[PDB]
Amino acid sequence: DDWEIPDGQITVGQRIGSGSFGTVYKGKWHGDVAVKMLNVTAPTPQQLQAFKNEVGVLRKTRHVNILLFMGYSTKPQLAIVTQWCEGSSLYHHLHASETKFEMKKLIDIARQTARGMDYLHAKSIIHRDLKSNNIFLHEDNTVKIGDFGLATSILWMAPEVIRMQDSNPYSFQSDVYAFGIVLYELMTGQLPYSNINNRDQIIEMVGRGSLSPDLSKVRSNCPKRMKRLMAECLKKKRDERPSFPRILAEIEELARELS
Ligand SMILES: Cc1ccc(-n2nc(C(C)(C)C)cc2NC(=O)Nc2ccc(OCCN3CCOCC3)c3ccccc23)cc1
C-alpha cells in the first residue's frame, strides 16, 4: 500500500508539544490529526532515521488500542500523521489529576492495555518504553498505546535493563516488567519508590536487586488474582515473567468475575 501524503495537503495548527527532536501540531487532514515533524530546515542523517524507523514500525500496527498511524510526508519537512484524540495520558489522570477511577475502569484500562501490548508482541514489536505517560486515554474512555516520548524512563526500567548487561537488554520480558509497574501504578494509584527522594538511589538499588515496589501500597480493593499477576511481571528474572498472552488471558478472567 502507499502511505505517503502529497505535499501541502496537511495543515498545521498550534504546537501541541516539542522534543528537539520532534514537535507535534494539531493538524487538519480529512478531519483532525496530529503531526510530528522535524522543523530543522534540512533533515540530518540522524533524523532521517527516527523518521524511517518510526514509520517502519507504525505502518505495521492496526489495532484499536494502538494509536492510529495515518500517513507520512517528506517535502515541506519530514512528518508523521496520526489520529487526533481528545483525552489525557494515564500518567496525567493518575498522578496529574484528582481523577478517581472506579476499580472497573482501572481494571479495564489494564485489560485494554494488555490487548494493546499483546498485539505488538505478536507482531514481534517491542515497545521498549511502556509507561503511564505513553498510555493515552481517548474520549477519556479507551486506551491508545504509543511512544509520546520526543527525546529519543527509570521507574519502569526492568533491572536487567538498568544494568547494561549484554546490550541487548530489551525483550518482550522487559516489556512485561514495564507493564508490571503500570499495574503497580493502577492498583496503588502511586508511582513506585514514593518516599525515596534521591532519584539516583533507585537506579543502583533497583538493579542490584535490593529494591522492588512495596506492594503493601496496592489498595485494598485490588483482586488477589490481580496483585499476584502484578507481582508476576515484576519478577526480577526475565524468564520469571509471564508472557502477554498469559497476562491478557488472566486479566480477562479477573474482569469476568468483578463484572
Ligand atoms: C523513533 C520512534 C520509533 C517508533 C515509535 N513508535 N513506536 C510506537 C509503538 C511502540 C506504539 C509501536 C509508537 C511510536 N510512535 C509514537 O507513539 N508516535 C507518536 C505518538 C504520539 C503522537 O502525538 C501524540 C499527541 N496526541 C496525539 C493524538 O491527539 C492528542 C495528542 C504522534 C504524533 C505524530 C507522529 C507520531 C506520534 C516512535 C518513535
Structural domains in the chain? 1-86 (3.30.200.20), 87-259 (1.10.510.10)
Other C-beta atoms closer than 10 Å to the C-beta of 215 total 15
Beta bridge partners, 4, equal: 72
| Nearest residue (CA) to ligand 1, atom 23 | 34
Other C-beta atoms closer than 10 Å to the C-beta of 212 total 17
Helix count (H) and strand count (E) of the chain? 8, 7
Beta bridge partners, 96, equal: none
Closest CA to 144 of 47, 228, 244, 34: 34
Quote the Cα angle for 231-232-234, to 5°. 65
| Nearest residue (CA) to ligand 1, atom 24 | 148
CA 58 – CA 142 distance, rounded (Å): 19
From the candidates 2, 129, 166, 200, give the one annotated as an active-site residue: 129
| Nearest residue (CA) to ligand 1, atom 16 | 147
Task: Measure 148 CA to ligand 1 centroid, in angstroms.
Answer: 5
Query: The C-alpha cell of 157 is what?
Result: 526500567
Q: Best substitution site from 12, 48, 58, 90 to test ligand 1's pocket, by max atoms within 8 Å of Cβ?
A: 58
| Nearest residue (CA) to ligand 1, atom 7 | 147
CA 18 – CA 52 distance, rounded (Å): 19
Residues annotated in the binding site for ATP, as ranges?
16-24, 36
- Is 129 among the residues known to form the active site? yes
Task: Measure 259 CA to ligand 1 centroid, in angstroms.
Answer: 33
Indicate the helix (H) or strand (E) that contains 176. helix 172-188
DSSP 8-state secondary structure symbol assigned to residue 59: T
Indicate the helix (H) or strand (E) that contains 70. strand 69-73
Q: How determined?
A: X-ray
Is 147 near ligand 1, meaning CB less than 6 Å away? yes
Tell me the residue length of the chain: 259
Please return the burial class of 209, using the count of CB atoms within 10 Å of its CB with bins 0-12, 13-18 and 19+. Answer: exposed
φ, ψ for residue 242 (rounded to 5)? -65, 160
Is 16 near ligand 1, meaning CB less than 6 Å away? yes
Contacts of 30 (CB under 8 A, 6+ apart): none
